[PDB]
Paper text:
To gain further insights into the molecular basis for the biochemical properties of TtAA10A, and to probe this, potentially unusual, dual Cu structure, we determined the crystal structure for the recombinantly expressed protein to 1.4 Å resolution. The overall structure revealed a core immunoglobulin-like fold decorated by loops and a helical bundle as typically observed for enzymes from this family. In the axial positions around the active site copper ion, TtAA10A has Phe 195 and Gly 105. Tyrosine 3 is adjacent (5.3 Å) to the second Cu site, thus providing an efficient charge transfer pathway between the two copper sites.
In this context, one of the most significant breakthroughs has been the discovery of chain-breaking “lytic” polysaccharide monooxygenases (LPMOs, sometimes PMOs) that oxidatively deconstruct recalcitrant polysaccharides, most notably cellulose, chitin, hemicelluloses and retrograded starch (generic LPMOs have been extensively reviewed, examples include).
Residue numbers in the entry: 1 to 78, 79E, 80 to 152, 153C, 154 to 208
The structure:
């Protein structure tokens, strides 16, 4: 059970930090409101660690209706599929570390891969519609696997047992303006259990 903590995923902002029954910030208000308007329940955001399936993820499974929720098991659509102006954090291309928090279900021992996709370079973020696969690159920009549970087998993937985190280092493609990263944490074939996390990032406008 997990989600991306850094950079903060939709589940980190709206889930780990802000809860709809007692928010301390306005940043998730639209996501919370639009989900209630669509018949979603406030209590669903308490399952921010549970965007889950039991299969090989987007490298294999091409037919999902939804991106961030991946037509998963806890709810479909997920809270995280809701069209909204989601909270966005400033981000840079090149070598970046992504931090999965797996504290609520620290399945280190049969972790197999961490996969990351980004929106196409010409993507135009639309807060009124759901993400579609046409918004995303066909292939992942970062796909790091280990012999299951053996983190010494990939120098890009680190287990932090003290924080119950997995740290993955990725080469983030050059981007400008507002983008989305779609990420997966997959366990091996014993379960094929896989967790999904979207990150809203703003690359700004900078060129040498
Ligand atoms: Cu943490
Ligand atoms: Cu779990
Ligand atoms: Na490693």
């Amino acid at each position: 059970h997990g989600y991306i903590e850094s950079p903060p995923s939709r589940q980190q902002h709206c889930g780990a930090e802000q809860k709809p029954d007692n928010p301390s910030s306005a940043k998730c208000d639209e996501a919370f409101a639009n989900y209630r308007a669509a018949g979603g329940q406030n209590s669903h955001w308490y399952n921010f660690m549970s965007v889950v399936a039991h299969h090989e993820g987007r490298k294999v499974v091409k037919g999902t209706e939804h991106v961030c929720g991946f037509d998963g098991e806890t709810w479909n659509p997920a809270p995280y599929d809701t069209p909204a102006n989601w909270p966005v954090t400033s981000f840079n291309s090149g070598q970046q570390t992504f931090v999965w928090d797996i504290s609520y279900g620290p399945h280190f021992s049969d972790t197999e891969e961490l996969v990351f996709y980004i929106t196409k370079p010409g993507f135009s973020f639309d807060p009124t519609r759901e993400l579609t696969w046409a918004d995303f690159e066909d292939q992942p920009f970062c796909d790091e696997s280990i012999v299951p549970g053996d983190f010494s087998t990939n120098s890009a993937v680190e287990a932090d047992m003290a924080n119950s985190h997995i740290n993955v280092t990725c080469n983030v493609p050059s981007r400008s303006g507002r983008h989305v990263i779609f990420a997966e944490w997959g366990r091996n074939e014993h379960t094929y259990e896989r967790f999904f996390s979207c990150v809203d990032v703003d690359f700004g406008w900078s060129h040498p």
